[PDB]
Amino acid sequence: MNIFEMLRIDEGLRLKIYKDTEGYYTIGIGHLLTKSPSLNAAKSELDKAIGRNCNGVITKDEAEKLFNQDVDAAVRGILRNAKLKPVYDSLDAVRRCALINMVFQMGETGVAGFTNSLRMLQQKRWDEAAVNAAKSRWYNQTPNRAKRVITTFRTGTWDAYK
């Protein structure tokens, strides 16, 4: 297991525009297109991202392409974020993947708001961080995913994904 496989599991793969868990237009592997409720808007943004007139449909390769870009940007965002970077650097390999997953999902801003959990992760207080992070909207809205991520932070293993 790796970051790609882990996120391909939590996000799925869809070749046509779809609405995510929050009702926003997305495509591929969790590639958010827009928060606007206009499908035309979504289609515009998709053609812009792909570079061709997609007409709301892409290929698997194109989807994997977006995903590579998105993972990369997520890591890069972490590294540039003053509150995130030090946590990330203190972690082991598996746990870093759990942090990339949350950032991918909710944006660095959203993740940088889990102040308390981040601190506990930094101190290597696994159970405590896991209990604190579950007290969140994130966990109450996407509980199966949130649990897999939290178990990962908690144990440092891929058991939740096996």
User: Annotated catalytic sites, by residue?
Assistant: 11, 20
Interface with ligand [Kr] (CB under 6 A), residue from 91, 129, 146, 160? 129
**Which one of 65-73, 78-86, 94-102, 144-152 is the stretch in contact with Cl ion (CB under 5 A)?**
144-152
Mapped onto helix, strand or coil, the DSSP state of residue 27 is strand
Write the burial class of residue 83 (CB in 10 Å: 0-12 exposed, 13-18 middle, 19+ buried): middle
Instruction: Name 25's bridge partners.
Output: 19, 34
151 is an interface residue for Cl ion by CB under 5 A: no
The entry of Cl ion, ligand [Kr], none near residue 150 (CB within 5 to 8 angstroms by kind) is: ligand [Kr]
> Residue 117 touches which of Cl ion, ligand [Kr], none (CB < 5 to 8 A by kind)?
ligand [Kr]
Answer positive or negative: Cα dihedral of 65, 107, 89, 118: negative
> Three-state SS for 16?
strand
- Which positions lie near ligand [Kr], rule CB under 6 A? 114, 117-118, 121, 129-130, 133, 150, 153
